[PDB]
Design a protein around this ligand. Structure first.
Ligand SMILES: [K+]
Ligand SMILES: [K+]
Ligand SMILES: [K+]
Ligand SMILES: [K+]
Ligand SMILES: [K+]
Ligand SMILES: [K+]
Ligand SMILES: [K+]
Ligand SMILES: [K+]
Ligand SMILES: [Mg+2]
Ligand SMILES: [Mg+2]
Ligand SMILES: [Mg+2]
Ligand SMILES: [Mg+2]
Ligand SMILES: [Mg+2]
Ligand SMILES: [Mg+2]
Ligand SMILES: [Mg+2]
Ligand SMILES: [Mg+2]
Ligand SMILES: [Mg+2]
Ligand SMILES: [Mg+2]
Ligand SMILES: [Mg+2]
Ligand SMILES: [Mg+2]
Ligand SMILES: [Mg+2]
Ligand SMILES: [Mg+2]
Ligand SMILES: [Mg+2]
Ligand SMILES: [Mg+2]
Ligand SMILES: [Mg+2]
Ligand SMILES: [Mg+2]
Ligand SMILES: [Mg+2]
Ligand SMILES: [Mg+2]
Ligand SMILES: [Mg+2]
Ligand SMILES: [Mg+2]
Ligand SMILES: [Mg+2]
Ligand SMILES: [Mg+2]
Ligand SMILES: [Mg+2]
Ligand SMILES: [Mg+2]
Ligand SMILES: [Mg+2]
Ligand SMILES: [Mg+2]
Ligand SMILES: [Mg+2]
Ligand SMILES: [Mg+2]
Ligand SMILES: [Mg+2]
Ligand SMILES: [Mg+2]
Ligand SMILES: [Mg+2]
Ligand SMILES: [Mg+2]
Ligand SMILES: [Mg+2]
Ligand SMILES: [Mg+2]
Ligand SMILES: [Mg+2]
Ligand SMILES: [Mg+2]
Ligand SMILES: [Mg+2]
Ligand SMILES: [Mg+2]
Ligand SMILES: [Mg+2]
Ligand SMILES: [Mg+2]
Ligand SMILES: [Mg+2]
Ligand SMILES: [Mg+2]
Ligand SMILES: [Mg+2]
Ligand SMILES: [Mg+2]
Ligand SMILES: [Mg+2]
Ligand SMILES: [Mg+2]
Ligand SMILES: [Mg+2]
Ligand SMILES: [Mg+2]
Ligand SMILES: [Mg+2]
Ligand SMILES: [Mg+2]
Ligand SMILES: [Mg+2]
Ligand SMILES: [Zn+2]
Lengths: 102, 252, 58
RNA sequence: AUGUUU
RNA sequence: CGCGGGGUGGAGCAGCCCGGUAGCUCGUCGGGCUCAUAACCCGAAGGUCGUCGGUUCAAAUCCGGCCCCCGCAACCA
RNA sequence: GCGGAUUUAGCUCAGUUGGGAGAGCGCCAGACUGAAGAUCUGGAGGUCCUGUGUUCGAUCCACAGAAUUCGCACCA
RNA sequence: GAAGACAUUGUCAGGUGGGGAGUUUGGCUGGGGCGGCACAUCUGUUAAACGAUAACGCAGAUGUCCUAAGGGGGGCUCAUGGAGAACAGAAAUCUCCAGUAGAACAAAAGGGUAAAAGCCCCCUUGAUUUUGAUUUUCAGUGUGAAUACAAACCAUGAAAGUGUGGCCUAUCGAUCCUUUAGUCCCUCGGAAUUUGAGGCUAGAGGUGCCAGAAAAGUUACCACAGGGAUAACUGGCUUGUGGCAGUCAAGCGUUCAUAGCGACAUUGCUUUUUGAUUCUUCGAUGUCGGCUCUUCCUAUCAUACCGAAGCAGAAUUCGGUAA
RNA sequence: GUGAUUUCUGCCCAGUGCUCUGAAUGUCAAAGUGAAGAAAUUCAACCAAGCGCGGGUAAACGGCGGGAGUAACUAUGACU
RNA sequence: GCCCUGAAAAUGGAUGGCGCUCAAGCGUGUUACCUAUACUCUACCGUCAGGGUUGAUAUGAUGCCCUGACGAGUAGGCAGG
RNA sequence: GUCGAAUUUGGGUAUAGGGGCGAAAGACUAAUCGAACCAUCUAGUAGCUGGUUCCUGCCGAAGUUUCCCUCAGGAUAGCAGAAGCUCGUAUCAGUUUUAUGAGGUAAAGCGAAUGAUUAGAGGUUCCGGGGUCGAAAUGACCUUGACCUAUUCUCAAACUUUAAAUAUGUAAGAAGUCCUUGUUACUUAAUUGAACGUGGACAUUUGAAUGAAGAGCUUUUAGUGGGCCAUUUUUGGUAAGCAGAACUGGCGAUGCGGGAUGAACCGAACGUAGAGUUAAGGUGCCGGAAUACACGCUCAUCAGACACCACAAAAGGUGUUAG
RNA sequence: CACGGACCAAGGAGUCUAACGUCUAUGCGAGUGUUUGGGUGUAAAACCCAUACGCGUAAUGAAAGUGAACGUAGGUUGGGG
């Protein structure tokens, strides 16, 4: 799919609360941090003897991930998240469809 | 899931050496003042068979320099050594067959046997029948003697280490075919319980890595890593190469 | 071993043993899905009606 | 340096 | 996910290691030498450097995303 | 019988994204030779395995077959 | 004597390590395995005109695709056929006429649609925010999908209106954990500030066995609980297949259908074939073949007596009574 | 491992093993080092063996092709 | 229509058997008759329901009495013994 | 088989269970070996098999929905019992009638759409054209078509204009109807409308039939979650006492009379007895009941003799009977 | 022609406990529970008892926290008595 940027859409920033311009980027998960309580608990459980102590997922079935748009209001910097349907190719750039061309 | 035969050998229950009929450990004299500074003369009283050993042993009687008595020593007889022969052992003994000399005191090219790896160890190298060590040179500074071992390996030994001039008697022994399972039986009856050998491929998988299968076959490479563990080291351990050897040996 | 997959056999008999009961209609039915604007105005209309009827009971 | 048959 | 390395004429490589600039061999074609062939000799044609963007008085080169190949290492929904 | 594959000028084959039926070995013709072989040029050669449908057309997008083959067909 | 702050030894860390330890190694299934997915789903039919409705039924389809192929508005009308114009024919571009949709609407099928839902153009982000209600699946739980409102902010149009993704029916995902966004709100419990961490609300990283364990084989050395809920034997149903027998009569039989045969068709019988099924037997009906022995059936090879012949004799063939 | 004697033991190191090389060489743990921070900590560089890179090895495990045209009858192909 | 040919299987056997021929067979019609734990009436047992009766000698008011209807049963539930 | 050396054998000794030992069979290791024996953990766990102990009375099932690593199990809903509770002018209903909807199956249709499908006819030579001329053009014909026109024979689960029967939604009143006018922040141009109201009027039939051991309500729990059979509709299969669905009735869970016999068929469902009458089925004898009555048909050297049901077909016969 | 049962006697299988749901009976009732313990005793009994504690009388929110009358504790409809 092809999604444009700058997204005139609703903002909840408590200052706009209205339709404003939103820059669009693709959400990225972010590095899993140590000292998060689940990671601390998992490391403590994995220490010592006993082997792997929690499931490790193997039976993968999805061939796509759900694209998430991080939408940033250009005036108040408030961010919103929009989920798109599953797609195999996602582009943020332009090159819109041109009709009647050879 | 069963302990294999080469693992069971280490416990030494039925795999110990059959030493009842043996004449005693074959050793040079204790390296003492007489051998360190001059020489000592002994007499070959008997040349006797040693059970489990191809080479004959020589009983050499010396005089105890510190107490009035005789000290019998069990040397490995070199070829040409005879009863009633005077054996001379020490730094100042002559270059004659049967004499025990420090490796540094012999010229290059000398053929010695029962050679000590370290001075005073009373003999470690070239002890089997027909085997011998070749002196190939000396390093008088930081005194060392270069020798060639029966395996062809070059070794640097202390020049104070002793050896018996000549070749170990009983050579040519392995040239005669045993010709008989009975002769192999009587050979190993007086050495150890290492015969006969069942092929691991003729066993079941529980007994050996080579066991099992609807045909007798190894199934995986018989060359086994040096870092493998006990129960895995069956076959050709840490083999550099395999197959029929063609060409010349002594890689350098 | 395969087995039966589905049947509605005996289901009507089971349902009619305790009978099919009509759903007990009530007057003043619930206003659950009623238009919330109408409900909001209805609350104020009923409040005003109650206050008028209370004040007019002299 | 090479170049096949009659 | 991480760290790296590689993509250059039809084919195999250099030039990249800091911009002075696209080259070497095989291959193709034309001619020459030979009675003829190969070698040989003289020419011509062949990529503009994996795709875009970025920094440069004038970048294949330096930088950032992306496509493909390989090695190692990592794995709680 | 199931799971697969391939079917293109006489032979081996490349097509293929809704390009366009083409290349070598064959054959023919002309070169060269005294004449052959070898080479070097030019040409023809299919109604793309058959029949029916969907596309603007179609090996190629696209249905029912046909032919050639590979693997499996086991526990009593 | 050698050796020397190196070996060794202790701890941690990386590699190696079926030598060994523990465990696992789906389900449906006309037995199981192989195959397939009927396992989560959608269209038409089966399906018997409310709804619901099964089979490894039938014909197919889904894990995508689309910043437009979403939304609004305007203008226009499509497939096809006929008649016309240089190159240009049978397909190019131009013109008219007819044209109820025979086109197109992303995909499978069904439905729907003509001043439109189709084609072209213009503007846009309603594919937005908040949390409820409702329909299908249904336990009236979840998830997915969808419907109608409310409270905002927008888009479009002159406007009425329309828009909370795709004209509708499929196109998808719990707990825990991680991560992001928001509220800049609560807590870190002796009191504070700043980092950090934990909370609340909303998403994402996924379980396709799709209400969602983390999982390779082999056993002809085998074990246990069971199962006739289930295969391998007989028996029972059936008789596709096998075997056997009829009816017609185009033809063969030199002529001549029927001496003997007999096509194209069609009606049967039998359970000595092999299938189909799984009703009996898995706390056990001894599982091939041969040997031996008795009896039974007749669809009769021979023998008895006969009828018929393409029966001169002989031999033979067809048939009847006959086991 | 094979299994008296006799006669031999052919080709293949691509795959899986085994083995030899080693600071030219990518990846690479703990400890240690540097930077930032108020610190927890984060990042970076360095980074042993191993793997990778290069070589050897089959009396190691093992493996060791297909199609069609062609010879004064047919046939088969020495041949290509 | 009935009958016959078509019409062949294995232990000896089956309109149930015997047997039956203007049937004791087939088609049809009319009566009479036989008998279920079914129907009708009555009696008794129990269950359920609706009632009457503390006005005493009435010591059994969960008692006594009146009326009507009902009674199959695995798994299972409850009650009285 | 072997019998003078890998010989046989006593005693001593060593090797002990994931261990030993094995000239190798997974062999032997005290009748125990693909991991000995003994005791304990241990009454190990078992969705699996077996059993589960007195009587009577009343009520009385399910093999179905959804979910599950689920398919021999469970949860869930349903069926059932018990306890009851609130009332009982009464409430409702596996039913009809009236009024009003919905459906796309049976049937029907194809000179109606789609898809099939048989044949002839007439127009298309500008029909696609070919043969043959035409010196050649389709120009003259012969004519194979390919269309068009009007006909014609036969069809559709995934075709249809039409369209049943059965089944199915709703309504048949006091929670109704009618008249006047109060509230609102909704809505309207507007007391305009919407909803909820105050007040007033209408009881014999308060607005069809029939019935009503009453209606309504609540809690909590058992078992069940293998089903099978019959008529009818119906899918796969040649078919099946096969396999899978729909409605109902049954068997399971059910005795009794009949079908000789039999889970399902017919009749009828059951406290203990008496009497009468019957059902289905029977009345020669077995065997209770007419060798009854009446009209005909049949002679079988395999007659025939009551549905389910225990079989028979095509084709034939101056047998006989009636047309 | 599925399994157990040759016979008989005796034994022989839904128990108790901790914590609970519904229902019922009893006591008290916005309170309730004496029995941890103490006092007492005819001594494991019976009798008596303080302070606590549990549950209930308040909920809601993750939490900080806040915390239940406009009204005759409301209006309308039905409602036994
Ligand atoms: K652990
Ligand atoms: K093996
Ligand atoms: K291992
Ligand atoms: K296993
Ligand atoms: K048959
Ligand atoms: K069995
Ligand atoms: K190799
Ligand atoms: K190799
Ligand atoms: Mg720790
Ligand atoms: Mg650790
Ligand atoms: Mg050997
Ligand atoms: Mg051996
Ligand atoms: Mg063996
Ligand atoms: Mg092993
Ligand atoms: Mg191995
Ligand atoms: Mg074997
Ligand atoms: Mg079932
Ligand atoms: Mg010549
Ligand atoms: Mg293991
Ligand atoms: Mg299975
Ligand atoms: Mg329906
Ligand atoms: Mg429009
Ligand atoms: Mg869905
Ligand atoms: Mg709107
Ligand atoms: Mg998710
Ligand atoms: Mg979290
Ligand atoms: Mg603290
Ligand atoms: Mg599931
Ligand atoms: Mg069975
Ligand atoms: Mg047949
Ligand atoms: Mg038996
Ligand atoms: Mg028997
Ligand atoms: Mg016969
Ligand atoms: Mg041999
Ligand atoms: Mg070889
Ligand atoms: Mg480190
Ligand atoms: Mg290294
Ligand atoms: Mg007959
Ligand atoms: Mg009779
Ligand atoms: Mg009669
Ligand atoms: Mg009676
Ligand atoms: Mg009473
Ligand atoms: Mg009863
Ligand atoms: Mg074996
Ligand atoms: Mg027990
Ligand atoms: Mg009952
Ligand atoms: Mg699961
Ligand atoms: Mg069972
Ligand atoms: Mg339909
Ligand atoms: Mg029809
Ligand atoms: Mg069950
Ligand atoms: Mg069955
Ligand atoms: Mg049962
Ligand atoms: Mg019955
Ligand atoms: Mg009968
Ligand atoms: Mg009688
Ligand atoms: Mg007939
Ligand atoms: Mg039987
Ligand atoms: Mg049993
Ligand atoms: Mg028994
Ligand atoms: Mg007893
Ligand atoms: Zn904003």
């Amino acid at each position: 799919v092809n999604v444009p940027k700058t997204r005139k859409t609703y903002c909840k920033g408590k200052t706009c609360r209205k339709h404003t311009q939103h820059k669009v980027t693709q959400y990225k998960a972010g590095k899993a941090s140590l000292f998060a309580q689940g990671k601390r608990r998992y490391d403590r459980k994995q220490s010592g003897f006993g082997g792997q102590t929690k499931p490790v997922f193997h039976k993968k079935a999805k061939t796509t991930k759900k694209v998430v748009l991080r939408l940033e209001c250009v005036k108040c910097k408030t961010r919103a998240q929009l989920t798109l349907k599953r797609c195999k190719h996602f582009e943020l750039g332009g090159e819109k469809k041109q009709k009647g061309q050879a | 899931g069963r302990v294999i035969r080469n693992q069971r050998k280490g416990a030494g229950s039925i795999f110990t050496s059959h030493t009842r009929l043996r004449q005693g450990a074959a050793k040079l004299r204790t390296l003492d003042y007489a051998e360190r500074h001059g020489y000592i003369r002994g007499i070959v009283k008997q040349i006797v068979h040693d059970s489990g050993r191809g080479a004959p042993l020589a009983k050499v009687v010396f005089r105890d320099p510190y107490k009035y008595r005789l000290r019998e020593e069990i040397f490995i007889a070199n070829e040409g050594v005879h009863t009633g022969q005077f054996i001379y052992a020490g730094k100042k003994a002559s270059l004659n067959v049967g004499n025990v000399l420090p490796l540094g005191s012999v010229p290059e090219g000398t053929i010695v046997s029962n050679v000590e790896e370290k001075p005073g160890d009373r003999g470690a190298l070239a002890r089997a029948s027909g085997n011998y060590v070749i002196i190939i040179g000396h390093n008088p500074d930081e005194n060392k003697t270069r020798v060639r071992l029966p395996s062809g390996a070059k070794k640097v030994i202390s020049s104070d280490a002793r050896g018996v001039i000549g070749v170990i008697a009983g050579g040519g022994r392995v040239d005669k075919p045993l010709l008989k399972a009975g002769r192999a039986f009587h050979k190993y009856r007086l050495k150890r319980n290492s015969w006969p050998k069942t092929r691991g491929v003729a066993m079941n998988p529980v007994d050996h890595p080579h066991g099992g299968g609807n045909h007798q076959h190894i199934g995986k490479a018989s060359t086994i890593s040096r870092g493998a563990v006990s129960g895995q080291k069956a076959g050709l351990i840490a083999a550099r190469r395999t197959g029929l050897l063609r060409g010349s040996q002594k890689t350098q | 071993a395969k087995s039966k997959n589905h049947t509605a056999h005996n289901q009507t008999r089971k349902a009619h043993r305790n009978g099919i009961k009509k759903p007990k209609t009530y007057k003043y039915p619930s206003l659950k899905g009623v238009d919330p604007k109408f409900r909001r105005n209805h609350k104020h209309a009923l409040h005003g009606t109650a206050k008028a009827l209370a004040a007019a009971k002299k």
